[PDB]
């Protein structure tokens, strides 16, 4: 958030514009507003569409995480409703579902899931999970064996197994959607558009000065602020899985998921 | 609204601009229209996309609430169609479905669900529900218990149980979606910045217009201002869909419809079932 | 088409503006184009987005009606494919399905479904349906009973019952979707504000076009007003999809299509 | 079809008129500045933008529905092969229905005679049943459904596997309804014509408004702008008839051939 | 792009040194008409880019579904039939073959080496003999699932759960094939590109009256803004074109192979 830096440099560029207006018609240099109107409206259009895309990715990310909570709540719901007495199963599945959420956070944050895993699962499971090119996937497989074994033992039918299998499928879709949003970056343009906006804002006073004279800085900074604010919104929407204040609060969301699942299985945080 | 204040303040700034125009050249200050055009067009473009995001949130809230009515109607339809004789289960499940709606409403309004729940559920359940940090979720789990019991007693097969389970799933998506929409909107921070940008734009505008319009300044300036502020205020009215304002969702009426709907669909006759 | 009114109304102001221009200097009033460019462009942007929303609402209402035809077509196909000999059950269910659509139309037009119900259903059922304050919903429930009976009788299994149950769900989504779109549209209030803004703008516009256009004022002004008024009125047309106007959804025709479909050839099938 | 080249020629002519008739503009009091035409052009571009968006989406939807036919038919055949590998008679019958469905859909949307295609694929008895119907394509689905219906009655399909295939007939029904929906007069088609006339009027007036500024340049600039608006506007009419036979409508014949070839490929024919 | 920028500079010089001549003869270019046109062009490019982006997102989503569906199908095989490792390995081969085969089909490259490395020779012959190889692979995968069903190792229910996944892959195949053909408004895109090109080359002549020697600077900047946006659109429209960036597609086919070898304990290397 060196937007305040970019403003100050604008005020500076404005002063340089006023000062150097003295030599403007002489060097053979004239700068009108109308060409900058054209360019500025074009950039605003492009910024409008770009931000629209950024916003949508951020919302999709928030939604995918939304689905983790919904699908996990419902899997636990089904286990209790279908197998009310299998409390061991209840607890092991819950510990996989909770491990899934934390490991999803670690995967997207590019951090180590070991501590969280060790808190939740026996060490043999941790080892098996850590060895996988995709830990969240191994957890889904392991949650799968729990309902799998219940099915082998005749406690679930093929139908009731399928109802719960569908929830693991839904979690696979969340996993896939997040990995798609993480490793998605023509982000190359987000930077190009940014430099465009920067260059435009810094050239702008030079074009305004002929008309506004001493008023240049105020108008220049006002227009710069509007474009720079809008442009920086994109930047803040473009790393939804990051650690910045305006990124998704994944730690808090994992705590909510865990709290919900412990609540449903009669445990106290 | 506060908009009439904003218009009147704009008239004032216009009159100041007319009367302070004289001192303009003396202070060496020019304000042309062209840079304000650029700025205004930029702001309008941004307001367009912003409002589009606001509208979408409101429409989603509305769809989520539409889903409750649909999912609950069909769950009751399925119970009557599949277990026509099981009136006690019908009444238990209906009262959970109605409790879910009211509970959802209270949670989003951050109001006390107690009256509505006491009105609908037996006391052993009501205290269990208010014991949770997640009452609405608890109510779904209890509705699930009902159909779970019909399964265990052989009244529902695994298949017919499945058909009803799927409807509990739809209600779960509603709960999750509503909860997501209830937390601070995405990039709210900017919506506030934009509003301030619009405010500053409207109030600086006459100073830009005056050199061209003179006394006509107030008329044109408040007109432009009304256009920008009306559009910007629409976004505020759309952003709290679960709020208590009249422009927000009539959640109370919606929960009444749901209740009346499910009561309509059931009732009458005793017998061992 | 009070666009023809507003256009003439606009041609008046255009004359006024030609007869005043000189007298502007005497009253101390200048009105340049540029401020009106800014304001007109903003309005166009907001009109664009607003129309988009209106259009989306219209299209959704159209798709929901499409679903009625699709889901009713496939429910009857399932009955024919799974229980080919059960012609009595076919007739009964088909009449509920046909009653569903007409009942949905009446609900959305706020008209009396009594005649249509009596044409299709037993009187006992017509009274049952009219008793409900949600009659379309009651029809689905009644359609479901037919399917339910066939399952209790063991003619459908749980699986094949489930296949048909899904189609009743689909019709439930349509009922719900339509009820949602029938209620006063999102921020309807603003479409009325935008409408007034467009009007005022078109009215004030010639007063600011004179200085540039002189005599050409009424022509260019009426052209601009048509463009903005055309587009705004389109919103009006799209906003009430279940209305009775000629530009609203042809609900009677669509209900006729559904009926002819389900009764294709005295309801006979290979 | 391509009447734009006309409108361009009419535009060059109005440019020549404008130049010639410019002098007499005074002593009448008729001026045309660019600025009000800037306002009008921009408003038109915005509306063209939104309108073309809807036209584009409708054409995309027509293409997607046809794509669903390929997908749903592939998988129905796949399912039949995988579930009943030995039942080649049923394979051939169901395939001929699925192929018949495709061609009949095309005939329906083109309002052409399906008879020869139907006869090349099905026995006369079935062709008779199909053509007797007021809704032939829908009746083909019913017949396809009776084929899988019979396999179910004979116990070769269980209810579960009958269900898997029934779902594909549902998809085909969504395609049929969707196409019938798209085949009817577009939402607000009337405005499309209104917008067209607006663009035409604007384009023919434009050179009168530029001549003041551009003199002899008028014809070249007015035609460049006119082309731009007319190119964009004519994209609507290019996208508004997806089922037609023009070069830029969907190649339904080739698509039906692709469908047929795929199904024949999958059944060793 | 850069060649169109330098030509823009060259047109600007031509504009400066010739400005005097032509304006004398009664041929004027002002800024306002080019402002109208440029803004209209920008509006059109906005909408165009919007369609380009949406095609791109669909491609990403379709390939996302390959990973999801293939992962869950293999998970189902292990959860439902834990002991059936031969069947596991065969099906994994078909799934991995499907992905590589899809990529080859979309890129129009030769799938033979990927097929020959994954599958028995007889099966490769069958697949290469078909005009729809990727579809043939789906059919073969379905065969494996269908065989376990005939042997009564899958019930109809559990067979069904897996059949659903094969369906997801059928929708990926077709969506990608549809995306692979020429875009719906491709002809206009050619028109708009040329329209941007001509606008950029004429622009200096419209500016020079106002900017003089500054003309090459403002002209090159405006041009860059328009051509960047156009260029981005070109890339996005064509997620499987023969000019595409192959990194993500290759990445994805490798990720899924790795994932499935992991899931069937073919990794890591034994002790
Ligand atoms: Cl769920
Ligand atoms: Cl528990
Ligand atoms: Cl439902
Ligand atoms: Cl009851
Ligand atoms: Cl009842
Ligand atoms: Cl259907
Ligand atoms: Cl499919
Ligand atoms: Cl065959
Ligand atoms: Cl001249
Ligand atoms: Cl075969
Ligand atoms: Cl294995
Ligand atoms: Cl394994
Ligand atoms: Na970050
Ligand atoms: Zn779900
Ligand atoms: Zn438990
Ligand atoms: Zn899936
Ligand atoms: Zn539903
Ligand atoms: Zn009852
Ligand atoms: Zn009792
Ligand atoms: Zn209380
Ligand atoms: Zn004066
Ligand atoms: Zn359907
Ligand atoms: Zn019959
Ligand atoms: Zn004049
Ligand atoms: Zn005059
Ligand atoms: Zn004159
Ligand atoms: Zn499908
Ligand atoms: Zn065969
Ligand atoms: Zn055509
Ligand atoms: Zn294995
Ligand atoms: Zn590995």
Numbering used by the authors:
A (entry chain C): 22 to 206, 208 to 291
B (entry chain D): 22 to 294
C (entry chain B): 22 to 291
D (entry chain A): 21 to 289
E (entry chain E): 24 to 294
Passage from the reporting paper:
Human bestrophin1 (hBest1) is a Ca2+-activated Cl− channel essential for Cl− transport in retinal pigment epithelium (RPE). Although the structure of hBest1 is still unsolved, two Best1 homolog structures, one from bacteria Klebsiella pneumoniae (KpBest) and the other from chicken (cBest1), have been previously reported. Overall, the channel is a pentameric assembly with a single ion-conducting pathway, which varies in diameter along its length and is constrained at two narrow points: a “neck” contributed by three residues (I62/I66/F70 in KpBest and I76/F80/F84 in hBest1/cBest1) on a transmembrane helix, and an “aperture” formed by a single residue (I180 in KpBest1, I205 in hBest1, and V205 in cBest1) on a cytosolic helix. Here, by electrophysiological and structural analyses, we show that the neck and aperture in hBest1 are both indispensable Ca2+-dependent gates, and their dysregulated opening by rationally designed or patient-derived mutations causes Ca2+-independent leak and elevates Ca2+-dependent channel activity.
hBest1 P233A is a patient-derived mutation localized on the C-terminus of a loop connecting to helix S3b. Tiny Cl− current indistinguishable from that of the untransfected control was recorded in HEK293 cells expressing the hBest1 P233A mutant, despite normal expression and membrane trafficking, indicating severely impaired channel function. The corresponding KpBest P208A showed alterations in the local structure (2.5 Å resolution), as the hydrogen bond network around P208 is changed by the alanine substitution. Notably, the location and position of these critical residues within the channel structure are well preserved among species, and patient mutations have been reported on all involved residues in hBest1 (F84, P233, Y236, and W287). Therefore, the P233A mutation may impair opening of the neck through Y236 and W287. Taken together, we concluded that hBest1 P233, Y236, and W287 are critical residues involved in channel gating at the neck.
